[model samples]
Target: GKITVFAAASLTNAMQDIATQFKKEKGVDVVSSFASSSTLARQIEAGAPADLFISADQKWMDYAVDKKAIDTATRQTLLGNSLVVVAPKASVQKDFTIDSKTNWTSLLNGGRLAVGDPEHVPAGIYAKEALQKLGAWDTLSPKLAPAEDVRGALALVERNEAPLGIVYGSDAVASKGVKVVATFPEDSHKKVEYPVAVVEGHNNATVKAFYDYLKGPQAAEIFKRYGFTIK
Candidate 1:
């Protein structure tokens, strides 16, 4: 009668809507937990009650699979996204043109840039990749306020504790307190792709039904409304 889903925080709003539709149409309840993909993957690996796992990047999903926490046959690339730089909604900061020649330090203006830990979080991994490619890592490294996850980083910017944050473009769209200041170019980092799979020992017909529903047109419609690019 219900399924538990472990999904990336960037999917929060979109998944919520999808769950509602799933329940309304199929009479099946969905229980979802949101966090950085890294965290959710680890939890799934540790035997958390997850019928499905959705990672913001391929790395963590691979981690879960390597740990034998997910059913490989059910895996699929589900969606795409763009990276963005966001600032407090009230800020008057000019848009950033991210590239090798961009002056990242000046943009900080002695303030911290909130980000998920590049050590694990997918958003931070992409953020670091973009900065490293642009040669801005050294200039911005010490200025970063690393958070537990992407949403934690976004919250820092929302509360004005950090003047800026690097999050998924969809995250910026879902957040009312932060505004996108720049959209990172596609070449700046790796592709922002989402991979999903049914969890280990939970790939029954019920879960598979919802899994197919997620890849269906109805789910794609809700995902796009939140700025996600369905694959």
Candidate 2:
């Protein structure tokens, strides 16, 4: 039997590694689908086939609960992350410091700043909150090139399509083409947390095993290696 996981796009690298290890140990095939947490949640609500769901934030997981897409008893907070501002690796700008008083517009130099769609994506929501707290939201809102997810925003910066992007710190670390220019202060927004749960109607032996595996030491080590803070 196989286990399917619908997870937030930001979990791609870490989850892949963990899934691979799970296959080696359990002899059950693992299939993973990654996207923005909200997108994945809605897909599950619309009847996507998945045994488990891992959301980047509790909001999406709560949304899933409301939609009856996941088993409430199985939900657990799994990890934490930090928001960061990134630039292309070849960018000439250095000594950049992000603070509430920083002139975000000047940093763009007429180029757009990339971010996830603030309306739904968790990373974008975090970025928007940080910007709002910094007093930079209104001025930078029109300058944003909103992407489908944090990885998409990172790609915009990686390809030089956008001069800067707001993404998870782990994402910036994973991409060789991007460099972290600044990290948003923790207090600027709500804590970034990941929550996981078994799909309500799909939980079974294989799914149960994999779900437990994800919380075990091996997966925790892989997540930590990918810069996630285990919860």
Candidate 3:
């Protein structure tokens, strides 16, 4: 049987590898869709044909549960991630350590900062939190190029459409064209946790098998290799 896994955009490369491994081992067709956590959660709530969901943050997963879009018992915190600021590979941006004194303005030098829309995207929410804690949000707000998802933000920098971006550490690791210029301080934002669960109507053996697979050691290795910390 086939199953559709809706995962966070930051999990793109890692999920692809895990899905491929699952398909190879189970001989089951695994269809994976990657987008921002909010987008995927919204799609799941809209009755998208999703068998499983892997969210970038607890907020979206909780939203799915509140909407009765996913099975509550099956939910589990699956991973953790770091937030990073990235710049195009050819850019001369210098690495900066984030702390209470960090400021995000003046670094763009008249260019936009690409990021997932802070309204709904989990990555952008964390970015907003981090910037706020670092006292950078007020001035950085106007010079932003909001994207539908974190990967869209990464792509903007990769394609040279934006000089800088705020995305997950995994995204920066996945893309060759974008280099991480700054790492967010751990205390700057809420801990970044990824949660996974079976879609509401898909809590069956077929989907459960894959859900369990995602929590296995093999998948943990793959996620770790992709710059994520196993939860």
TM-score per candidate, chains pooled? 0.98, 0.98, 0.96
- Flag regions of model 3 displaced more than 4 Å: none
What tens digits encode model 2's per-residue C-alpha lDDT throughout 114-198? 9999999999999898888889999998899999988999999999999899999899768989898888889999999999999
lDDT of 1 by residue, 1-231 (tens): 889999998899999999999999999999999998998988887778899999999999999999988889999999999999999999998787877788777788899989999999999999999999988898888899998889999999999998889999999889999999888899989999999999889989999999999989999899999999988
Which scores better on lDDT, 1 or 2?
A: 1
lDDT of 3 by residue, 1-231 (tens): 999999998888998899899989999888999888898898888889999999999999999999988889999998999999899999998998777666556778899999899998898999998888778888889999999999999999999999889999988778989899988878889999999999998988889899889989989999999999998
Please give the lDDT score at residue 130 for candidate 1. Answer: 92
Whichever of 1 and 3 has more lDDT, that candidate is 1
| Whole-model lDDT, model 3 | 0.90
Per-candidate RMSD, Å: 0.9, 0.9, 1.1
Candidate 3 at residue 151, lDDT? 91
In candidate 2, position 6 carries an lDDT of 94
Query: Model-by-model lDDT, in order?
Result: 0.92, 0.91, 0.90
Instruction: Give the worst 10-residue stretch by lDDT in candidate 3.
Output: 97-106
